[PDB]
Each structure stands twice: as C-alpha cells, then as structure tokens.
C-alpha cells in the first residue's frame, strides 16, 4: 500500500499504519 | 516536502517512516 501514489486521506492513512504507536507529522506545506 | 515524494511522485517505506515520530 506504500509503493503508490498517496495524497490526502490516503497519505495520512499510510503514516498511521506505518508509524503506528510512534505516531507521525503530516506537514503538507514543509 | 510529503507532498512532492509521496503524493505527485510515488511514494516508499523508507521515506514514509522519515515522518514517523
Ligand atoms: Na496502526
């Protein structure tokens, strides 16, 4: 599910999963 | 940014995991 294009929810979908109990940053701007 | 390595280009674990805490 990573090895796509992600944008949006999608994006935001693959950092929870991936990241789990770290959690993330989503810095669309950055 | 995200936007431009996993949105308008194709995205990957090992840079996906670089936004983990
Ligand atoms: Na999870």
Redesign the pocket.
């Given at each position: 599910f990573v090895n796509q294009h992600l944008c949006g929810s999608h994006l935001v979908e693959a950092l929870?999963?991936v990241?789990?109990?770290r959690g993330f940053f989503y810095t669309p701007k950055a | 940014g995200i936007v431009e390595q996993c949105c308008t280009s194709i995205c990957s674990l090992y840079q996906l995991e670089n936004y983990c805490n």
């Open positions: 929870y999963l990241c789990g109990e | -």
